[PDB]
Design an enzyme around this catalytic site. Structure first.
Site, PDB file in Angstrom:
ATOM      1  N   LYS A  73      25.565  -3.828  39.600  1.00  0.00           N
ATOM      2  CA  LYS A  73      24.611  -4.240  40.621  1.00  0.00           C
ATOM      3  C   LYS A  73      24.520  -3.379  41.873  1.00  0.00           C
ATOM      4  O   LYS A  73      24.343  -3.903  42.985  1.00  0.00           O
ATOM      5  CB  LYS A  73      24.774  -5.679  41.085  1.00  0.00           C
ATOM      6  CG  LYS A  73      24.671  -6.775  40.027  1.00  0.00           C
ATOM      7  CD  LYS A  73      26.026  -7.468  39.889  1.00  0.00           C
ATOM      8  CE  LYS A  73      26.189  -8.219  38.573  1.00  0.00           C
ATOM      9  NZ  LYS A  73      27.605  -8.700  38.453  1.00  0.00           N
ATOM     10  N   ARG A 121      18.495  11.157  31.772  1.00  0.00           N
ATOM     11  CA  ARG A 121      18.010  11.694  33.034  1.00  0.00           C
ATOM     12  C   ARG A 121      16.482  11.588  32.906  1.00  0.00           C
ATOM     13  O   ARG A 121      15.921  11.663  31.797  1.00  0.00           O
ATOM     14  CB  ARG A 121      18.555  13.115  33.208  1.00  0.00           C
ATOM     15  CG  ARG A 121      20.043  12.972  33.508  1.00  0.00           C
ATOM     16  CD  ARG A 121      20.588  14.194  34.127  1.00  0.00           C
ATOM     17  NE  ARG A 121      19.912  15.043  35.060  1.00  0.00           N
ATOM     18  CZ  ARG A 121      20.360  16.066  35.786  1.00  0.00           C
ATOM     19  NH1 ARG A 121      21.619  16.454  35.715  1.00  0.00           N
ATOM     20  NH2 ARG A 121      19.507  16.778  36.512  1.00  0.00           N
ATOM     21  N   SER A 259      25.813  -3.702  46.547  1.00  0.00           N
ATOM     22  CA  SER A 259      24.868  -4.686  46.983  1.00  0.00           C
ATOM     23  C   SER A 259      25.523  -5.649  47.950  1.00  0.00           C
ATOM     24  O   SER A 259      24.929  -5.870  49.009  1.00  0.00           O
ATOM     25  CB  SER A 259      24.337  -5.443  45.752  1.00  0.00           C
ATOM     26  OG  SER A 259      23.325  -4.528  45.335  1.00  0.00           O
ATOM     27  N   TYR A 528      -0.735 -27.710  52.051  1.00  0.00           N
ATOM     28  CA  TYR A 528      -1.875 -28.501  52.446  1.00  0.00           C
ATOM     29  C   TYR A 528      -1.505 -29.974  52.460  1.00  0.00           C
ATOM     30  O   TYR A 528      -1.585 -30.520  53.562  1.00  0.00           O
ATOM     31  CB  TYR A 528      -3.019 -28.279  51.462  1.00  0.00           C
ATOM     32  CG  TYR A 528      -3.656 -26.922  51.571  1.00  0.00           C
ATOM     33  CD1 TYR A 528      -4.127 -26.349  52.740  1.00  0.00           C
ATOM     34  CD2 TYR A 528      -3.904 -26.233  50.384  1.00  0.00           C
ATOM     35  CE1 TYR A 528      -4.824 -25.126  52.718  1.00  0.00           C
ATOM     36  CE2 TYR A 528      -4.583 -25.051  50.339  1.00  0.00           C
ATOM     37  CZ  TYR A 528      -5.036 -24.473  51.527  1.00  0.00           C
ATOM     38  OH  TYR A 528      -5.690 -23.268  51.382  1.00  0.00           O
TER      39      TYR A 528
HETATM   40 FE   LIG Z   1      16.246  14.040  38.212  1.00  0.00          FE
HETATM   41 FE   LIG Z   2      -5.142 -21.345  51.752  1.00  0.00          FE
END
Ligand SMILES: [Fe+3]
Ligand SMILES: [Fe+3]
Ligand SMILES: *[C@@H]1O[C@H](CO[C@@H]2O[C@@H](C)[C@@H](O)[C@@H](O)[C@@H]2O)[C@@H](O)[C@H](O)[C@H]1NC(C)=O
EC number: 3.4.21.-
Length: 691
Positions: A73, A121, A259, A528
């Protein structure tokens, strides 16, 4: 005085020998520290990283992909920049180089000899093999794609290939001993310059490298002339015409890191200084972007010009681009599993409740629809960017962000008209008319007008939606130019804001009291129906919604507990002239006209999306063959799950097929102005990927 180092991971001896001088000149000038680590491969370096025995390493696009997979990760944190100080670019082209004198195009390579930069690659593997796939008669797994290319060319040099199983792929490598065809410098025909040298020596007929190689390695201008490029349209062109003749435009190599507890400032602090001090002709003591006489690209690409920081919302998938990223993944798939994936529409669902409905729809689609999901709309747009999801219906607010991200509007939700059409058989071609953005209040609040809304309690559909935020906040912004949006009102419920903020004090969360202020349907005050709800339950003093919202949740139009007993006559509208009007005169008492929620997608899926959708509504539409006997696309009763419950149909755009054209000049100028007070991690990610 305790962040002792940014441990760089080296992949060879020369590298380490390069990384130590590096360290020697870093402390010499009092720059941030960096200590070196040794290993034998990019893979070894990715692993050292994932398990804290080093912090960073520059990889090619192919290894970025791999470094990003679990259980590693890693994330790209800094991108190499190429070109010159005047035209820097964080991308390069994968070209196919040949020698003047022959007359074979890119469709006629079967049985020729090839030189590649290395297994996996970008330019030496992923790109050329994916372009060539049509020509390989590959059977798909479990037979490795390596086997198909090995029957393709008579011989090749593909450093890292299994000499073992694919002797053919190793035939032309020049290494001596067990070095033959290794993935390192012990292998003379390794990387851009080895691949280019394999061509030069007359060992292979085509070299798969980058556009600069020929310029980096052929000093004198006339030597280059002995070379040509194989273009995708079966034409040869001069080496300098790479722009009009390349197999793909690819992301620049990048430094990856962890990460989770990555050390991202240390790294950037280090790189930033290193570039300054030892960048492009800055020190004869040491050169960051140059190699000792027998080497090439130790640690970084030679002749790179600096680094470019990668905005935090970016992951490997997003860094590679949907094209590249999916092309990689398609190398491990049959042509049939790949065609099945092109035919199928993956919907992105915002919250559990939208997933559930999507699942419902999925089973009744005769394999055309599948579900993907995330908990924010922004996260779903990221998924469509990674090719991992294809589509969703969006508020015009979000079509702005999606369009900034390169996505396109494909069909719009159509709503009842300016009272033209009856139960309209031509709803798919009936041009969209906008919906009305209104400011609703309780009738009792006799004194509440537009003029004195400020400082009160507000209810918003969500941050960055048209009716709910852009229009109200835009009009308000226009009066004081203040960017301190959490001060427009004493308290609010504006889902998607900081829950520690004023902007979230009135959100009540889900049925259990968790999920407060989240921007999805688990927050009872979302959208809404929810911003209206926030009004009717006396939390707020004004709800920024649309006019049909009130119609729909009053007069026994919504039996839910909170709604049951609401009568239209109890709510009024705020007009911009000071006045208040009944909800039925919204047409002469509204804030602005809002562009219709539109479904957006990637450019590659447009035409197949259009067909699945037309087809699916014909059957589960407003007036559709299976609605309501089995499933109704457009109904979720007051919930507005996936689409708005009042969608008549999904209609055609008439030419406005770009966010700009769809939303309008004026709309786009306005958001753009608001955005200057603050962009999202996502808009920052996309500006980065667009340069
Ligand atoms: Fe490359
Ligand atoms: Fe909307
Ligand atoms: C690939 O198979 C080619 C022949 O078969 C048929 O026609 C060609 C043009 C392709 O479109 C193919 O998919 C069709 O089945 C052979 O001519 C060629 O030599 C094949 N394989 C390799 C690696 O040589």
């Amino acid at each position: 005085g305790r962040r002792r180092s940014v441990q760089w991971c080296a992949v060879s001896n020369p590298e380490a020998t390069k990384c130590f001088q590096w360290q020697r000149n870093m402390r010499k000038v009092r720059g941030p520290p960096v200590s070196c680590i040794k290993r034998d491969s990019p893979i070894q370096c990715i692993q050292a990283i994932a398990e804290n025995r080093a912090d960073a390493v520059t990889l090619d696009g192919g290894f970025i992909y791999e470094a990003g997979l679990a259980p590693y990760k890693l994330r790209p944190v800094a991108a190499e920049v190429y070109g010159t100080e005047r035209q820097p670019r964080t991308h390069y082209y994968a070209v196919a180089v040949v020698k003047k004198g022959g007359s074979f195009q890119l469709n006629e390579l079967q049985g020729l000899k090839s030189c590649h930069t290395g297994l996996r690659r970008t330019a030496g593997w992923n790109v050329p093999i994916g372009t060539l796939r049509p020509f390989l008669n590959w059977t798909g797994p479990p037979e490795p794609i390596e086997a198909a290319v090995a029957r393709f060319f008579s011989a090749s040099c593909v450093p890292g290939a299994d000499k073992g199983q694919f002797p053919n792929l190793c035939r032309l490598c020049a290494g001596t001993g067990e070095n033959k065809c290794a993935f390192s410098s012990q292998e003379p025909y390794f990387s851009y310059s080895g691949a280019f040298k394999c061509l030069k020596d007359g060992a292979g007929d085509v070299a798969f490298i980058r556009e600069s190689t020929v310029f980096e390695d052929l000093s004198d201008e006339a030597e280059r002339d002995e070379y040509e490029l194989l273009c995708p349209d079966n034409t040869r062109k001069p080496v300098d015409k790479f722009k009009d003749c390349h197999l793909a435009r690819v992301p620049s190599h990048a430094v990856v890191a962890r990460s989770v507890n990555g050390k991202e400032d240390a790294i950037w602090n280090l790189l930033r200084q290193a570039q300054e001090k030892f960048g492009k002709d800055k020190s004869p003591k040491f050169q960051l972007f140059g190699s000792p006489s027998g080497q090439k690209d130790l640690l970084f690409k030679d002749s790179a010009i600096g680094f470019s920081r990668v905005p935090p919302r970016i992951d490997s998938g997003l860094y590679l681009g949907s094209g590249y990223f999916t092309a990689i993944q398609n190398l491990r798939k049959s042509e049939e599993e790949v065609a099945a994936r092109r035919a199928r529409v993956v919907w992105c669902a915002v919250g559990e409740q939208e997933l559930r409905k999507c699942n419902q729809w999925s089973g009744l689609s005769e394999g055309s629809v599948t579900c993907s999901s995330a908990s924010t709309t922004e996260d779903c747009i990221a998924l469509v960017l990674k090719g991992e999801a294809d589509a969703m219906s969006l508020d015009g607010g979000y079509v702005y962000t999606a369009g900034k991200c390169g996505l396109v509007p494909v069909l719009a939700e159509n709503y009842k008209s300016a009272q033209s059409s009856d139960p309209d058989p031509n709803c798919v071609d009936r041009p969209v008319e906008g919906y009305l953005a209104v400011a609703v209040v309780r009738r009792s609040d006799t004194s509440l007008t537009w003029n004195s809304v400020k400082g009160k309690k507000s209810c918003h559909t969500a941050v960055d939606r048209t009716a709910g935020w852009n229009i109200p906040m835009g009009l308000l912004f226009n009066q004081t130019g203040s960017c301190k949006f959490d001060e427009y009102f004493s308290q609010s419920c504006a889902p998607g804001s900081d829950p520690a903020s004023n902007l979230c004090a009135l959100c009540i969360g889900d049925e259990e009291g968790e999920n407060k202020c989240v921007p999805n349907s688990n927050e009872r005050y979302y959208g809404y129906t929810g911003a209206f709800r926030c009004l009717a339950e006396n939390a707020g003093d004004v709800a920024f919604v649309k006019d049909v919202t009130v119609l729909q949740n009053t007069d026994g139009n919504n039996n839910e507990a909170w709604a049951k007993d609401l009568k239209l006559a109890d709510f009024a509208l705020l007009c911009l002239d000071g006045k208040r009007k009944p909800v039925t005169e919204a047409r002469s008492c509204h804030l602005a006209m809002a562009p219709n929620h539109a479904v957006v997608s990637r450019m590659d899926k447009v035409e197949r999306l259009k067909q699945v959708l037309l087809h699916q509504q014909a059957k589960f539409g407003r007036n559709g063959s299976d609605c309501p006997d089995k499933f109704c696309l457009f109904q979720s009763e007051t919930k507005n799950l996936l689409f708005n419950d009042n969608t008549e149909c999904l209609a055609r755009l008439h030419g406005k097929t770009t966010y700009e054209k769809y939303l309008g000049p004026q709309y786009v100028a306005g958001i753009t102005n608001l955005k200057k007070c603050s962009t999202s991690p996502l808009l920052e990610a996309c500006e980065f990927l667009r340069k």
